[PDB]
Amino acid sequence: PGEPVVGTGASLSVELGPRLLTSIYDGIQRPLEVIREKTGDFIARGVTAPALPRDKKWHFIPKAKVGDKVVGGDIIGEVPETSIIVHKIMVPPGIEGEIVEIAEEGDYTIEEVIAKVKTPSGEIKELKMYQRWPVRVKRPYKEKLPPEVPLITGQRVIDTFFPQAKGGTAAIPGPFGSGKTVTQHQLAKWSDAQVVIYIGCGERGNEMTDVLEEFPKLKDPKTGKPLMERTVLIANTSNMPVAAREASIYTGITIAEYFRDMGYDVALMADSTSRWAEALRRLEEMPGEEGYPAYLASKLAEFYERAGRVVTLGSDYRVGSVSVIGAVSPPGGDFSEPVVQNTLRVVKVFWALDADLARRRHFPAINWLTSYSLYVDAVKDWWHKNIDPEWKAMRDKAMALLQKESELQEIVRIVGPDALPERERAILLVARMLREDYLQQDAFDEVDTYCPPEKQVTMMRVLLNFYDKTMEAINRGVPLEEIAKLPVREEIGRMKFERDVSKIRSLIDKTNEQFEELFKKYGA
C-alpha cells in the first residue's frame, strides 16, 4: 500500500492476470465489500484485501523461447483460465528486449517469475502472470481504428436501425435492474464480445442480493457454461464510499482495455441511478487540479473516449476492442438534467427505452423515432460485403415507412381514419407489419431470443417485398381488404419463430404468387 506522491498520485492501480474472470469487486478491485476512502485532485487511501489470489495454481503454456525479441503487449504464454476464456500473458507496456529466461510449461502461482527480459541497455526485467496499471491512465495501443465492424447483438431493432460499432459508445435509459425491460440482459449475453465487464452500480435493495446468487446460475447461451466465466463484476452498493464508486468505471474500463489488448472484443456495461451530483456546490473559488463547473462533463467525455477498436501493442498485427454501453438514470427521470445531456453529447448511440412502448407491450421497448445511431454508415460496408448488399437501402426504406406512419397517425389523431385513401391505409398496414413482425422481438422464446444477421436481412426482404407488392396492387385496383387477408401475411407474422432461414426466404415467392392470384382474380 501507500508509496504516495504529488500530482494525481497515491498510485491508484489494478492487478491484471488470471482470476479477474468470475470475480466480484468494488470500485477499486477488492474481492468483496466495505472500507471507506476519500477522493481528491491529489491522492486516496485504503487498507486490506488481495485482488488476485496468490495461492491458486495456474497452468502456463509458454509461447516464446529464449532469444526472442519482445515488445509491450507481446504474448509470451497462455493460461486456460475458465472453460470459456484463455488468458493471454503479455509483456507489460514499456518493457522491451530479449527474452533471456522463460518458464517451462507447468503450474504456477501468479507471483512466480515466469520470464525474464534483457532490455536494450541491459537491465533485466522480471515478468509474472499479472501486471499492474494505473486505472486513470488509458492503456496504450498502436492505433485507434475508425468505427467499422458492428457489435452484433442479435436484436433486430438495434442491429438494423440503431447499430453499435465494436469500439463504440452507446447509452440506454434507467437502471439495469429495472424489471420493466430485458434488453440490458440480452445485450450482455448475446453481443459478440468474448468478455463482458459489468459495473452493476446504482445498487439498492435486492439490487445487490439477486445480482449475487443468479449470476453463478446464469448461462452463457453460446456455450451452455455460466456467463460469469467470461464476466468480471464490479459492484457499486449504497453502503460503499462515494470515492470507490466514482473510481469503479475507471477500474472497469482498465480491465476492459486489458482484455482488448489480448485481441478480444469486450463489452463494458456501466450501471447508474439517481442524484450522484448534489455534492457539487463556471465558479471555482478554491480550486487546484479540478476547475469545477461542468468540468465533470469533460471528464465523462474522457472516460467514453477510452472506448475503441485498436491495433494493440505487440509485434504481431492484433486487433481488440472495448465497446461501452452506459445506463442513464436522471434525478427525476426527466432526461433534461446534467447526467443525460452530458452523456448524450459524447455517445454515438442512444437506445430510447420508452415507458409507453412497454405499457402497450411492444418489446424491445425501444422508441424507433427518438433513438439514433451515428454508426449506420460506419457499419454498412460490413453488412453489404458479408451479409446482404442491400442492407442499408432496406433499413432506410423501412425507416422511411416508420416515419410516414408516424406523420399519418398524427393527422389521423386530428381528423380520424374514415377519409384515408387506400394507398395510405396500405402504408399503415405494412408499417404495422414492420412493427409487429420485425421490431418486436421475443427475448423469452427459444428461437426469437437471438436473430442472426442472415435471418434479419431475409425477414426484412420478405417485409419490403410485401410492401412493393402491396403498393403495386393498390396501384392496380386490388382492394386493400383483399391484401390484408392474404394468407401469407400470417406466415410473415410468424417468421421470427422459424429457425430455418431458407423457409423464411421462401415466403418471398409465396408472396409473389399469392399476389398473382389477386392480380388475375381482379383481372388487375
17 binds ligand ANP (CB under 6 A): no
442 binds ligand ANP (CB under 6 A): yes
Look up residue 355 and give its DSSP letter: H
Q: Is the dihedral of CA 12, 15, 16, 20 positive or negative?
A: negative
Q: Three-class SS of residue 472?
A: helix
Q: Which is nearer to ligand ANP, 77 or 364 (CB)?
A: 364
358 binds ligand ANP (CB under 6 A): yes
202 binds ligand ANP (CB under 6 A): no
Burial class (CB in 10 A: 0-12, 13-18, 19+), 404: middle
357 binds ligand ANP (CB under 6 A): yes
Confirm if 452 and 481 have CB atoms less than 8 A apart. no
Question: Residues 391-420 vs ligand ANP: string with x where CB under 6 A?
Answer: ------------------------------
Closest CA to 204 of 40, 329, 117: 329
Q: Which of 180, 225, 385, 423 binds ligand ANP (CB under 6 A)?
A: 180
CA distances from 285 to 7, 297, 338 (A): 20, 19, 21
Q: Which of 37, 271, 354, 405 binds ligand ANP (CB under 6 A)?
A: 354
Q: Which of 344, 355, 393, 484 binds ligand ANP (CB under 6 A)?
A: 355
443 binds ligand ANP (CB under 6 A): yes
Q: Three-class SS of residue 75?
A: strand
Binding segment for ligand ANP (CB under 6 A), chosen from 243-251, 253-261, 349-357, 376-384, is 349-357
Q: Which is nearer to ligand ANP, 370 or 475 (CB)?
A: 370
Q: Three-class SS of residue 372?
A: strand
Cβ at position 351, least distance to ligand ANP in Å: 8
Q: Which is nearer to ligand ANP, 144 or 185 (CB)?
A: 185
Supply φ then ψ for residue 439, to 5 degrees: -65, -50
Q: Three-class SS of residue 117?
A: strand
What is the Cα–Cα distance from 174 to 178, expressed in whole angstroms? 7
Q: Which is nearer to ligand ANP, 212 or 443 (CB)?
A: 443
**Rg of the chain taking only CA atoms, in angstroms:** 27
Query: Distance from CA of residue 233 to its chain's centroid?
Result: 15
Q: Which is nearer to ligand ANP, 13 or 440 (CB)?
A: 440
Cβ at position 177, least distance to ligand ANP in Å: 9
Confirm if 437 and 495 have CB atoms less than 8 A apart. yes
183 binds ligand ANP (CB under 6 A): yes
Contacts of 452 (CB under 8 A, 6+ apart): 154, 501
441 binds ligand ANP (CB under 6 A): yes
> To which H or E segment does residue 488 belong?
helix 488-492
Binding segment for ligand ANP (CB under 6 A), chosen from 179-187, 383-391, 451-459, 492-500, is 179-187
456 binds ligand ANP (CB under 6 A): no
Q: Which amino acid is at 478?
A: V
What is the Cα–Cα distance from 272 to 171, expressed in whole angstroms? 11
Other residues' Cβ atoms within 10 Å of the Cβ of residue 233:
19
185 binds ligand ANP (CB under 6 A): no
Binding segment for ligand ANP (CB under 6 A), chosen from 293-301, 309-317, 355-363, 493-501, is 355-363
Binding segment for ligand ANP (CB under 6 A), chosen from 162-170, 260-268, 405-413, 439-447, is 439-447
What is the Cα–Cα distance from 360 to 397, expressed in whole angstroms? 25
Q: Which is nearer to ligand ANP, 9 or 452 (CB)?
A: 452
Binding segment for ligand ANP (CB under 6 A), chosen from 100-108, 181-189, 256-264, 509-517, is 181-189
Other residues' Cβ atoms within 10 Å of the Cβ of residue 341:
14
178 binds ligand ANP (CB under 6 A): yes
Q: Is the dihedral of CA 281, 283, 284, 289 positive or negative?
A: positive
Cβ at position 180, least distance to ligand ANP in Å: 3
Q: Which is nearer to ligand ANP, 175 or 308 (CB)?
A: 175
Other residues' Cβ atoms within 10 Å of the Cβ of residue 461:
17
Q: Which of 353, 460, 474, 483 binds ligand ANP (CB under 6 A)?
A: 353
Considering only residues 362 through 381, tell me which ones interact with ligand ANP, judged by CB under 6 A. 363-365
Q: Is 167 left (phi over 0), alpha (psi -120 to 50) or beta?
A: left
Binding segment for ligand ANP (CB under 6 A), chosen from 9-17, 55-63, 342-350, 353-361, is 353-361
Q: Which of 150, 174, 202, 330 binds ligand ANP (CB under 6 A)?
A: 174
444 binds ligand ANP (CB under 6 A): yes
Q: What is the largest CA-CA distance in the chain?
A: 90
181 binds ligand ANP (CB under 6 A): yes
Considering only residues 257 through 276, tell me which ones interact with ligand ANP, judged by CB under 6 A. none
The C-alpha cell 491495433 sits at 311
Give the footprint of ligand ANP on this chain (CB under 6 A).
Answer: 173-175, 178, 180-183, 186, 353-355, 357-358, 363-365, 441-444
